[PDB]
Amino acid sequence: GSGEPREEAGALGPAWDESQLRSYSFPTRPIPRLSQSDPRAEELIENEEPVVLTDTNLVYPALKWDLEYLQENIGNGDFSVYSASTHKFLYYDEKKMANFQNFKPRSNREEMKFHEFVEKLQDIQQRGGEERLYLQQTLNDTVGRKIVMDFLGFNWNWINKQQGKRGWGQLTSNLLLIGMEGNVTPAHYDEQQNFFAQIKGYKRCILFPPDQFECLYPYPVHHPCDRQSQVDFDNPDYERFPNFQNVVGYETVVGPGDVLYIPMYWWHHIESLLNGGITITVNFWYKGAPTPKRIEYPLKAHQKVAIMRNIEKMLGEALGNPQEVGPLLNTMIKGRYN
Amino acid sequence: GSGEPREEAGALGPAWDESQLRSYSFPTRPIPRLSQSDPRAEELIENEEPVVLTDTNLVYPALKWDLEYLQENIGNGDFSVYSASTHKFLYYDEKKMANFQNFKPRSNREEMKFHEFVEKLQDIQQRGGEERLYLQQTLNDTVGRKIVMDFLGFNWNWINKQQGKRGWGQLTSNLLLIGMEGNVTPAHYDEQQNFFAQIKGYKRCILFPPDQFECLYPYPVHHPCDRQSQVDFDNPDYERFPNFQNVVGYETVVGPGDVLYIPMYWWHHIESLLNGGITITVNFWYKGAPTPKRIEYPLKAHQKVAIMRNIEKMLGEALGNPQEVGPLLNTMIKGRYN
C-alpha cells in the first residue's frame, strides 16, 4: 500500500493512520516518493510512470491556503460545486447527457459564490448532515489580487522545464479542488498529463496503468461517464466484470507539498482520508506530446486505448446514432472474433 | 423452395426432380421467375433484390457450348481448376494465406490447358474416382475465334442498359465455371453486382439478404476465407453459431438460358444438381454504383457490412498485425457493449 505512515516534522506524530483508508478487494504496491533532484524520478516521468515528488515547491505559496484565506481573497466569480448523497462523486459530462435519457446523475452541479460554499459547508457540519460537497473550479482571471500573487509564486521554472523536457502541449488549466473528508472521486482516466499538487489535508491516490483497461471496464465513449470505470469499488460485480479480480494498483498518500505525477491515460482513484478534515488540491493539466512521425511497434497500451476510443467515435458518427454502436460491435465479433 | 419442377418444351418431362437437391436445416421462399419485359423484374433489380430473368438472350450463342465445342475453340491459354476431395469448394484467397499459417486449404488450384481438364475429367469418370474438379477461369483475349464470335453475340444491348440504369461501374470480368454434378460453392457474398447466366446443366441457388449477416458468421476479413460463411451447411454447429437457426433463404434452380441477378453483398450458395451432369455458367461482375453524396438514414444492411469490413481493415493496419484484431475488439466490448 502507501507504506508506513510518514512522521511529521517536530515530532507531531503520524500524519495519518490505516484506519483512515477505505478497504478494497485489490492489492497494491506503493508509488515511489522521491526528490525532484533524484534522477530516478526524472526517469519515471520520462517513462510516463507515476511518482510522488516531495520538494518541488510547485505551490509553495498556496500551502497557507485554508477556507478563511480563500473566501477572503478568491474573488467573486462563480464556483462549480457538486452535491452527493453518497461519498462517491462520479463525473457526468452534461453535453453527453442526451444520448442516454435512461440515465439520471448522482451528483448535481451548482454554481455559487465562495462564501456561499463555505457557509453551505458550515450548515451541514452543525445540523449533522450526511450530504456531501466537492468544489471543482478552474482557476481564472476573476480571482483576488492576493491569490494572483500566490499563483505567480508557483514554481513555474520547474514545471515549465518539465513541460519542455517531455514535449507536452500547453497548460490547459488548473483545477482547484476542495472536498469534504471521506469524499471519493472514483476510478477514471484523463486525456492529459497531470501534476497533482496537494495543498491541505491528505489524499489517498490509487493508480492503475493503461494496460489494465480490460480489468476496469470504462463506460461507452458516448455515455456521460465516458472515461470512468463501471465497477463499484465498494461492491464489485464479478459476474459483469470478471477481470476486476485481476486488477493490481499503485498506491500512495499525498499531503501538503507533495506533487503526484499522474501520467496521461493512467487510471486514478482519489479519496480524501476519513476524518482528516477538508482537502485542497490544485492540478496542472497539460496536453500530451504530439504523435511521433514513425510509429513504433508493438504499440503502447495507451495507444490502443486511443484506437478503441476513435473506433467508437467514428462508429457513432457513421451509424448516425451512438445507441447502434453496441449492436454493430457485437454483431462484428460474435462467432467471428470471440 | 424452388417451386414445382418446370416442364421442358416438347414434353421432354421434368427438367429435374427433388431428389437432386441436397437437404438443409433452413426454410426458403422461391426467387421470382419473370420476363425481362416485366416491370416487376425491373423493380426487383432497382431495389437490389434477386430475380431470375427467363428471356434475356444474354448468352444465347453459348447455349450450344459443351466440352467438345470448347476444347475445340476455347484456345490455348491456361485455365484455373480447383481440386477437392469433398463436394464443397471453399474459396481461398492466396494473398491472405500468410496471416494464417495454422491454415491448410481443402481446395487446390492448378493451372492447365482445356484439353487437359476434359481428359482429367474423363479419367476420373472411368476409374470411379470420388475426386472432384471445378474450372473457374476469367474469359480473356487468348480465346478462340469462334468463342470470340459467341462472346460478341451476347446481348450487350440489354446488359449495358442495365449497367446504365443502375449506375454501376465497369464490367470487371466474366467468369467461366464448369463443374461436376454435386459440386457446391458454399455460402459467401461478393462485393460486385452479378448477372449469373446459366448455359448448360442445372444449378440450385440459395440466396440470403445482407441483413442476415449475424446468422451467417463470415470469417474474419484478414482470413483467407474472407467473405465466406464459417457454417458447415451440412453439419451446422449451433453452439458456435446460434443465429444460424434463424436463417431464412431465397431459393431457385436455373437452367440453360436463365439469368439470375445476384445483388452485391447478397449471400449465395450454389450447387450443381446431383446426377444432372456437368454444369456451365458465365457470370458478369460489375462494380457497384458509387456511394451517394447525401447519406440517408437509417443505413442499409449492406452499408453496415461495408462499415464492419472497413473497421477490421483499419484495425489490422493500425495494430500492425491482423492477429491482434480479435483481442482488441473483444477487449472493446466485454462488459462494455455486451
Partner: peptide
Amino acid sequence: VVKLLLEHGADVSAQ
C-alpha cells in the same frame, strides 16, 4: 489511417 486512429482528444474530468 493508423496515425488518425492514434490521435487522441484532451477530455478531462471537468465540465
